[PDB]
Amino acid sequence: VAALVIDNGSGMCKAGYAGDDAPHTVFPSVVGSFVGDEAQSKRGILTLRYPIEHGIVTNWDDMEKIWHHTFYNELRLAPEEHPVLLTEAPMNPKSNREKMTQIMFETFNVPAFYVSIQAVLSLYASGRTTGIVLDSGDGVTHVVPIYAGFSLPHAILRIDLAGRDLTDYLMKILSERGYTFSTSAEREIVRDIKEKLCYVALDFDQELQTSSQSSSIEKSYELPDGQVITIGNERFRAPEALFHPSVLGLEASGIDQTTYNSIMKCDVDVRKELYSNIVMSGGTTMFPGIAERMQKELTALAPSSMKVKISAPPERKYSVWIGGSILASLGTFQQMWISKQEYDESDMAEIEKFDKSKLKKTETQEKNPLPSKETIEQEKQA
Numbered sequence: 001v002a003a004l005v006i007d008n009g010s011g012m013c014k015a016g017y018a019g020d021d022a023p024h025t026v027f028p029s030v031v032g033s034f035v036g037d038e039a040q041s042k043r044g045i046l047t048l049r050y051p052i053e054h055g056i057v058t059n060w061d062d063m064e065k066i067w068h069h070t071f072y073n074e075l076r077l078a079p080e081e082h083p084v085l086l087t088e089a090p091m092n093p094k095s096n097r098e099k100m101t102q103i104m105f106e107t108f109n110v111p112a113f114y115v116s117i118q119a120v121l122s123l124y125a126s127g128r129t130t131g132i133v134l135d136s137g138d139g140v141t142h143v144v145p146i147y148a149g150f151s152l153p154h155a156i157l158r159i160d161l162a163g164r165d166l167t168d169y170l171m172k173i174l175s176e177r178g179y180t181f182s183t184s185a186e187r188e189i190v191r192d193i194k195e196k197l198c199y200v201a202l203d204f205d206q207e208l209q210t211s212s213q214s215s216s217i218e219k220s221y222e223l224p225d226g227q228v229i230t231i232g233n234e235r236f237r238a239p240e241a242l243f244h245p246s247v248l249g250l251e252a253s254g255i256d257q258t259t260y261n262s263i264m265k266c267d268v269d270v271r272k273e274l275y276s277n278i279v280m281s282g283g284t285t286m287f288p289g290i291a292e293r294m295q296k297e298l299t300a301l302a303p304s305s306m307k308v309k310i311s312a313p314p315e316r317k318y319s320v321w322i323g324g325s326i327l328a329s330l331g332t333f334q335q336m337w338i339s340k341q342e343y344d345e346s347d348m349a350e351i352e353k354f355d356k357s358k359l360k361k362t363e364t365q366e367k368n369p370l371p372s373k374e375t376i377e378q379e380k381q382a
């Protein structure tokens with residue numbers, strides 16, 4: 001039956017069917033045996049490992065289980081009856097791209113297989129073949145400039161500053177305020193707090209000065225045990241670490257300066273195209289206000305001559321996935337699959353034209369439950 005699209009991330013696995021407009025199932029990319037959402041909910045009695053760190057696979061035994069979980073537990077199909085399209089981080093080592101192929105063909109017996117660079121799919125999802133993509137997930141952030149469907153590898157930038165860091169940071173400035181967030185389970189509550197209440201300030205110092213004597217800044221959050229806590233300027237302080245990573249002790253450049261530094265590694269003739277085709281994807285780019293701040297920061301850095309236009313669609317959390325769904329539905333793409341045999345032995349205009357409104361409506365099942373107070377306490381005893 002239909003082709004499958006699996007986007008494996010550092011924190012989250014996104015799976016579904018080519019032609020649908022959204023992943024079928026999204027679940028944490030974790031093993032404790034139990035995988036993902038079921039491991040999540042039993043983390044009280046379990047030790048959890050994340051097989052993908054910074055977007056590169058580090059444990060193929062664990063990686064295999066997640067795919068097993070995707071096929072048989074989540075999507076509930078025979079993997080031998082469905083071509084699979086996978087995604088990979090840029091600069092993924094050939095050893096890994098080979099191992100990925102091996103397991104797909106030899107372990108799960110897929111009829112066809114293909115693997116794509118994530119940022120590229122996000123560009124496709126946005127209906128472009130030339131642009132610069134800012135792809136920030138849980139474990140890694142990438143800046144990937146792309147021209148006529150090909151990445152310019154010399155100018156691909158990577159910072160190890162992403163959602164993981166922002167979570168740990170938020171947890172760190174919340175601990176300073178007196179909240180006892182000390183376990184891995186409580187860390188997930190802080191992730192949720194981040195996703196719900198955090199935002200990026202247009203002007204950080206102005207807003208910071210205003211926060212000190214305002215009550216508008218304050219928001220309430222209910223913990224699992226039922227205690228309500230109140231979040232103040234931590235709301236915009238934690239995401240500020242994307243733009244000034246020094247507050248994390250990282251001597252990295254912010255996501256604004258790294259985007260600029262990337263473009264400037266490109267030919268002058270090309271830059272004008274990149275600047276007016278900036279695409280943001282990934283979950284970390286979901287903060288309210290991040291696009292307007294990106295717009296402002298880049299404008300103030302760019303030549304006055306070039307206009308800055310940034311694409312940040314509502315669904316950009318699952319852009320990479322949507323890119324795969326569109327890609328795998330293209331007529332000219334069918335000629336590109338790797339066949340089970342082919343392994344035993346060894347277009348540009350369609351993207352622009354593709355009508356996303358014809359992709360089938362899909363309700364994403366996000367399975368990533370938050371821990372009970374029992375589980376938090378279970379973990380406390382360690």
Ligand SMILES: Nc1ncnc2c1ncn2[C@@H]1O[C@H](COP(=O)(O)OP(=O)(O)OP(=O)(O)O)[C@@H](O)[C@H]1O
Pocket residue numbers: 008009010011012013054055136137138139140141162163164191194195196281282283284285286287288317
């Ligand atoms: N609305 C939101 N606001 C802020 N952060 C969010 C939001 N939604 C998700 N996140 C964060 O985004 C991250 C997950 O994003 P995403 O699924 O794009 O990355 P991934 O593919 O799992 O990881 P990677 O790209 O590192 O492999 C998590 O850190 C999560 O807490």
Ligand SMILES: [Ca+2]
Pocket residue numbers: 008009010118137282320
């Ligand atoms: Ca990702």
